[PDB]
């Protein structure tokens, strides 16, 4: 059971998801015990590799991100704005296909992000489960 039957309802009912729908505050959880300098490089360089560690500060919910479809270009943006970095990554959260989406300041190492149901992946997954 990789997913829950009522996958569609789960995302529009449970507070867990509803609270992570708006442009919540996000932040890079990587190497907090290291100089801000090293954290900046580590975060960017890893983003170039299609991975990072961001958590919704507000609720403290951590997430390990992998910017790839089910090095990228549309999943990890670096042109949409100087300094800012728009990321995107799919995954199965608590049995619900979703897509993480947000940006981060290459200097402040924080920003906003949110989750949004994945009609496509959800569908495919539900079929494999039957």
């Amino acid at each position: 059971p990789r997913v829950v039957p009522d996958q569609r309802s789960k995302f529009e009912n449970e507070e867990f998801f509803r609270k992570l729908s708006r442009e919540c505050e996000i932040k890079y959880t990587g190497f907090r015990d290291r100089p801000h300098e090293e954290r900046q490089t580590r975060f960017q360089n890893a983003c170039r590799d299609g991975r990072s560690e961001i958590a919704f500060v507000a609720t403290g919910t951590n997430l390990s991100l992998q910017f790839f479809p089910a090095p990228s270009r549309e999943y990890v943006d670096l042109e949409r704005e100087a300094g800012k970095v728009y990321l995107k990554a799919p995954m199965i959260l608590n049995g619900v296909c979703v897509i993480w989406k947000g940006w981060i300041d290459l200097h402040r190492l924080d920003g906003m992000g949110c989750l949004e149901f994945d009609e496509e992946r959800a569908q495919q997954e539900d079929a494999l489960a039957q």
Binding site: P1, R2, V3, V4, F16, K27, T29, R32, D33, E53, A55, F56, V57, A58, T59, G60, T61, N62, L63, S64, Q66, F68, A70, A89, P90, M91, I92, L93, N94, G95, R121
Partner: protein
């Protein structure tokens, strides 16, 4: 082999964690993550933690590899603290394609002292 508990994901279970423990102290029972559905041996599993007081707790040995549906963490420890009367929300991530993540709210409270008898 032991006593497992269900996580917020329908595909994963995990061993039982003490409700209160001392930071940086080895756990009474090795933490384990067990997959319901078939998961490839060698698949990496990681664990993170945080809440409203600490958005990301410092952890030690938070990485393990799946073997026969079981990811056995060797000496996982919690360094960061959750705050007075507060617990951590665990985020378990199984790196498959795509990655599967299972959370676990109010999993464990971590303080400097840990459990202590009255004074």
């Amino acid at each position: 082999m032991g006593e497992l508990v269900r996580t917020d994901s329908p595909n994963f279970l995990c061993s039982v964690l003490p409700t209160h423990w001392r930071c940086n102290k080895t756990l009474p029972i090795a933490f384990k993550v067990v997959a319901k559905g078939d998961v490839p041996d060698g698949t990496l599993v990681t664990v993170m933690a945080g809440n409203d007081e600490n958005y990301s707790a410092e952890l030690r040995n938070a990485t393990a590899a799946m073997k026969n549906q079981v990811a056995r963490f060797n000496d996982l420890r919690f360094v960061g603290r959750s705050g007075r009367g507060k617990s951590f929300t665990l985020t378990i991530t199984v790196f498959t394609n795509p990655p599967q993540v299972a959370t676990y709210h109010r999993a464990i409270k971590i303080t400097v002292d840990g459990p202590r008898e009255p004074r």
